[PDB]
């Protein structure tokens, strides 16, 4: 009831972990269809939850998150225009993804799974 069916809750947030691949932009459109957006990780607490959650899921797959790198600055932004902290910078158009315990960087036009996030009721 705070979260949709098939979604997982942590505090104010609900998350959906995909079982299909898409490119970064299309993954975002998939989240948008569900009234959500690609996962944004704004704290160590949330990162720890996300890494913990994926560990319960087979494989150490790649999951798009809502981070993209400007082609002029090289600077990372979440899709709401906020900057990640120095603890959540992807390791070295380009977009970010989570794999196991790490945030990494990839060409946006590649196929990965994705994680969506929306506010719980």
Angle subtended at Cα 78 by Cα 94 and Cα 115, rounded to the nearest 5 degrees: 80
Which residue in the block uniquely carries the two structure tokens 């989240």? 31
Check the CA dihedral 108-115-49-77 and report its sign: positive
Residue 36 touching Ca ion (CB under 5 A): no
Nearest CB to Ca ion, comparing residues 27 and 40? 40
DSSP-assigned letter for residue 47: H
| Neighbouring-strand partners of residue 1 | none
How many Å apart are CA 21 and CA 38, to the nearest integer? 13
Which stretch in 3-11, 33-41, 60-68, 70-78 sits in contact with Ca ion by CB under 5 A?
A: 33-41
40 counts as binding Ca ion under rule CB under 5 A = yes
Closest distance to Ca ion from the beta carbon of 50 (Å): 9
State the CB neighbour count (10 A cutoff) for residue 29: 12
Q: Shortest Cβ distance from residue 82 to Ca ion (Å)?
A: 10
Residue 22 structure tokens = 């898409």
Choose the stretch contacting Ca ion; rule: CB under 5 A; options: 1-9, 34-42, 67-75, 80-88.
Answer: 34-42
Nearer to Ca ion, 102 or 107 (CB): 102
Choose the binding region for Ca ion from 27-35, 38-46, 72-80, 94-102 (rule: CB under 5 A): 38-46
Q: Between 38 and 108, whose beta carbon lies closer to Ca ion?
A: 38
Give contact residues for Ca ion (rule: CB under 5 A). Answer: 40
């Amino acid at each position: 009831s705070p979260c949709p069916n098939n979604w997982i809750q942590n505090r104010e947030s609900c998350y959906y972990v995909s079982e299909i691949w898409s490119i970064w932009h299309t993954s975002q459109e998939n989240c948008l269809k569900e009234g959500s957006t690609l996962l944004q990780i704004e704290s160590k607490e949330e990162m720890d939850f996300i890494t913990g959650s994926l560990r319960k899921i087979k494989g150490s797959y790649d999951y798009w998150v809502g981070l993209s790198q400007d082609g002029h600055s090289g600077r990372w932004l979440w899709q709401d225009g906020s900057s990640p902290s120095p603890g959540l910078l992807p390791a070295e158009q380009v977009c970010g993804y989570v794999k196991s315990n790490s945030l990494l960087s990839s060409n946006c036009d590649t196929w990965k799974y994705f994680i969506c996030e929306k506010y719980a009721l």
